[PDB]
Write a protein that binds this ligand. Structure first.
Ligand SMILES: Nc1ncnc2c1ncn2[C@@H]1O[C@H](COP(=O)(O)OP(=O)(O)O)[C@@H](O)[C@H]1O
Ligand SMILES: [Ca+2]
Ligand SMILES: [Ca+2]
Ligand SMILES: [Mg+2]
Lengths: 362, 154
């Protein structure tokens, strides 16, 4: 009996088998249908995006199209991993502070539609902390949909101090699409969104000092980079490289009044008991694709230093594999018989229904 | 948001502690642990918690991860037991070993009713408390270690 670990990100499915060191299937969490008004999933939808309109069933960590999400799960089991789900206990993931109904319906579909023998829904940031070999620390997890901060002490997340911002990679992609119009470029369609997402991933970075960097960008072309579009045209981008992820520190760039990711991290630590704050400040763990911008750890270090007491020892841990830290933590925990002992069995679901997820999954 | 409407509404509850206490009953390594003053040591070996024989206590493979339970009499009562639980991470331990050592440290803490105080001990960064566990010259680092439990995806 081999458990499946399926990290359903807002943007990417990461799926594979417990005990493996990496997910064996990683593909876009998208369903595509003809742009001219029957569907394609994942890599193939991306491949045919020239004729398709692409839709993400998960927005900001919440499943908003359950029919399409069923297609995503079906595709993961039968077309990618090529497994029979009724043979595999399955570990799923979720952002914290999601509405309770999201995991209730996840539980219903896994048992009633896919007939899994057992399942568990884990909080993503907790899995990343264990992947880093820690029981105490504060995780900053940022994917395509959610940025969340989870302080954890001696293996228990502190719910009163968990913070969440519905601002992450997809918002940054959309913002890059917008600001590229200032150069005369027009990226508007769902297919064009995927092109700009690639530009963002390849060329963006976090400036250590934003205003200084803006001045550098105007002084000469030293920061400019070229990028070849699928149709062969070559575009040039400059200060957009760092203005795009600056939004994480200045959410007003997209009209949000929220605190930036440095302030939210500080605020989360400050919600915890004073005697554990030094341990949290020394163990900030980054996880998720939106934490991959070059320069982000250094900028976090600088900004948290400015907010914290002047003698506070601060460390940002940025694992190189952090696009997969949640998945890897799930692979480790799902390899442990005691962790699997807490999973919901099909019989428990038959007798108790979806509500049982809240009594078993923490 | 509204925590009570959310998927973290039951974090921090007695129910959470009860479920995790039950899970810790399914690990053979904890049976009889922490029953008397002394040091008990296990090594992670392909995801399993494996006892280290007492003759080896204080010697640690640099490629491996370990759990060290130190049982002692607290100042408050010379006839009762208190606990420090240290997880020791070798400089060359692999991610599966360190992650299992962390998770299973929490589990042993659960098994002992939350009483243990946890200490993460990376090789070369060991706490003053950890250095005090072993007699003069008792702390020794050994080359090598046991193979990772991970299967490598090419
Ligand atoms: N090198 C990078 N720089 C900036 N953003 C990145 C990078 N790599 C991936 N991303 C972004 O991270 C997100 C996907 O990361 P992931 O952690 O898999 O998210 P999710 O779990 O929400 O699917 C997307 O927004 C993607 O564009
Ligand atoms: Ca080893
Ligand atoms: Ca404890
Ligand atoms: Mg994610």
């Amino acid at each position: 009996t081999t458990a499946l670990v399926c990290d359903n990100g807002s943007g990417l499915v990461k799926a594979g088998f417990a005990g493996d060191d990496a997910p064996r299937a990683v593909f876009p969490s998208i369903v595509g249908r003809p742009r001219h008004q029957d569907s394609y999933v994942g890599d193939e939808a991306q491949s045919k995006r020239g004729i398709l309109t692409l839709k993400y069933p998960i927005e900001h960590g919440i499943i908003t199209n359950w029919d399409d999400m069923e297609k995503i799960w079906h595709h993961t089991f039968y077309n990618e991993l090529r497994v029979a789900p009724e043979e595999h206990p399955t570990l799923l993931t979720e952002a914290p502070l999601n509405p309770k109904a999201n995991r209730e319906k996840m539980t219903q579909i896994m048992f009633e539609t896919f007939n899994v023998p057992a399942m568990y829904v884990a909080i993503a940031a907790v899995l990343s902390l264990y992947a880093s070999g820690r029981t105490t620390g504060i995780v900053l997890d940022s994917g395509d949909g959610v940025t969340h901060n989870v302080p954890i002490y001696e293996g228990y997340a502190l719910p009163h101090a968990i913070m969440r911002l519905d601002l992450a990679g997809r918002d940054l992609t959309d913002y890059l699409m917008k600001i590229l119009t200032e150069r005369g470029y027009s990226f508007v369609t769902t297919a064009e969104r995927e092109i700009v997402r690639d530009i963002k991933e390849k060329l963006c970075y976090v400036a250590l000092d934003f205003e200084n960097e803006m001045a550098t960008a105007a002084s000469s072309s030293s920061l400019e980079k070229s990028y070849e579009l699928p149709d062969g045209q070559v575009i040039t981008i400059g200060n957009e490289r760092f203005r795009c992820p600056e939004t994480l520190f200045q959410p007003s760039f997209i009209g949000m009044e929220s605190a930036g990711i440095h302030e939210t991290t500080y605020n989360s630590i400050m919600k915890c008991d004073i005697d554990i704050r030094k341990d949290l400040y020394a163990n900030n763990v980054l996880s998720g694709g939106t934490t991959m911008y070059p320069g982000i750890a250094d900028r976090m270090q600088k900004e948290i230093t400015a907010l914290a007491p002047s003698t506070m020892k601060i460390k940002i841990i940025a694992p190189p594999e952090r696009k997969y830290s949640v998945w890897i933590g799930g692979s480790i925990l799902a390899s442990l018989s005691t962790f699997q002992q807490m999973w919901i069995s099909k019989q428990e679901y038959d007798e108790a229904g979806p509500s049982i997820v809240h009594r078993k999954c923490f | 948001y509204n925590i009570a409407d959310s998927n973290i509404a039951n974090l921090g509850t007695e129910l959470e502690k009860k479920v995790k206490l039950e899970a810790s009953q399914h690990e053979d390594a904890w049976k009889g642990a922490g029953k008397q003053v002394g040091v008990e040591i296990w090594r992670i070996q392909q995801f399993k918690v494996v006892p280290v024989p007492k003759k080896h206590h204080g010697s640690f493979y640099t490629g491996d991860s370990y759990i060290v339970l130190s049982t002692y009499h607290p100042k408050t009562n010379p006839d009762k037991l208190a606990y420090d639980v240290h997880f020791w991470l070798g400089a060359f331990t692999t991610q599966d070993e360190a992650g299992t050592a962390a998770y299973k440290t929490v589990e042993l803490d659960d098994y002992l009713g939350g009483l243990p105080v946890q200490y993460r001990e990376v090789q070369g960064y060991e706490s003053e408390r950890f250095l005090s566990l072993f007699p003069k010259g008792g702390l020794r680092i050994l080359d090598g270690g046991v193979e990772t439990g991970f299967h490598h995806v090419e």
